[PDB]
Amino acid sequence: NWLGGLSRAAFPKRFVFGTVTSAYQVEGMAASGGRGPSIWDAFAHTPGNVAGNQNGDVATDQYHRYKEDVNLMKSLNFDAYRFSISWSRIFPDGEGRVNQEGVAYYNNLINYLLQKGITPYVNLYHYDLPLALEKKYGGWLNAKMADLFTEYADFCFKTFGNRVKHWFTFNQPRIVALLGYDQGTNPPKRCTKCAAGGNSATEPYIVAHNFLLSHAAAVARYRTKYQAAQQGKVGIVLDFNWYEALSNSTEDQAAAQRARDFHIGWYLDPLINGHYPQIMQDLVKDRLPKFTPEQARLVKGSADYIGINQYTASYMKGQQLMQQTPTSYSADWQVTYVFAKNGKPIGPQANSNWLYIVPWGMYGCVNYIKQKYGNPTVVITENGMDQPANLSRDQYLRDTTRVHFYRSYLTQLKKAIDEGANVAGYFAWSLLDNFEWLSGYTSKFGIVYVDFNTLERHPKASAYWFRDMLKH
Ligand SMILES: [Zn+2]
């Protein structure tokens, strides 16, 4: 049968199933309703930055249609919805004056979710730094972000936390560091060669450190000021794609492990163990900031659960570790990506070139965190795949590859949970086709099709798969 034995009975009692969006990717009303610009507004409006020179001005217009979309997710038997609050919709300048119309939108959305029996899981940040803060403070390069983010978080806790009980601070800080400050392909477009300036060998590490310090500060504020009354939780969302040694050679096994450490360990060792991975300390040396004992103690234990965004897997080949002039976070890993093993690709690709369909990567990631980090509470906060541009409506709706994707990846998650992994929930990226960053509207990740001419929603086969799987 098309569920492949999956149902709510196949997962733990009270296991949470949801779908996911982010503010800039779905809301629209980017320069309306009092919202100030984010670094993504400025970036997307610059010709050449995004596929087709597209932007999130309108996106899916969830801002106007949110009750339609909530009705849809309830009809598909989901328990929860992960979405983000746009910082510049609340504070158009990132600090100071509150935009009451923005606050009203999130109140309305949260209230409707609760009315319809859908639990809100709310990200405070999803790439969309207020442009004013980038210009005034230099964004995540500035340690002052901890104070600025804490004050924003405090407002959100005060304003929404009597209703919202499941928070996340950041989303994929690794990708912000990598693409914003190593490769320079996401805002602020910084890198060694870049027009905007930068240094690919130092800035990614500064940025990651500031995300960690800012997360810890916001959680300390929650715990000391809001937790007694509100009794909720705050976590963080980290991407983790699996790395598998190309062979059982000492050097290939070491490479796959170095990659895991530079990818997920970069954040998880601080959050769980209060220090950066030893290999990062060894290889990155003085370019890796040092936590003071006090900071390390603030960061350690500061996530109530770990959100993992899990999409794909790669084979890794090793090499003798060399002394080399630093060039970039990416080059610091001293690993070699390889396409195939024993003449076979690791998996077929979805629309996105980086997205290899490798269901066993889900098991790899979850088992790895279980075994290495004392089995922390994990929530799979994103998992999904994309279709290309230019298909017909019917072609989008018959998304048999995505049905197969969810059945296979969820079977692998189930395998890890049945082996004892403390996974509390799973969220599909995305509820809706939406604005996919550099790919704009050319990448379709939704279980629900959105016609970007008419803005109409139509559930795809994968949406009905979830509805069947999740029936109560
Ligand atoms: Zn509208």
From Swiss-Prot:
It catalyses: Hydrolysis of terminal, non-reducing beta-D-glucosyl residues with release of beta-D-glucose. Pfam families: Glyco_hydro_1. Its EC number is 3.2.1.21. Keywords: Disulfide bond, Glycoprotein, Glycosidase, Hydrolase, Secreted, Signal. It is found in: Secreted. Coiled coil: none annotated. Glycans are attached at residues 248, 390. SUPFAM superfamilies: (Trans)glycosidases. A beta-D-glucoside binds at residues 25, 126, 171-172, 311, 382, 429, 436-437, 445. Hydrolyzes p-nitrophenyl beta-D-glucoside, p-nitrophenyl beta-D-mannoside, p-nitrophenyl beta-D-galactoside, p-nitrophenyl beta-D-xyloside, p-nitrophenyl beta-D-fucoside, p-nitrophenyl beta-L-arabinoside, oligosaccharides, pyridoxine beta-D-glucoside and the cyanogenic glucosides amygdalin, prunasin and dhurrin. Possesses pyridoxine transglucosylation activity. This is Beta-glucosidase 7. It comes from Oryza sativa subsp. japonica.
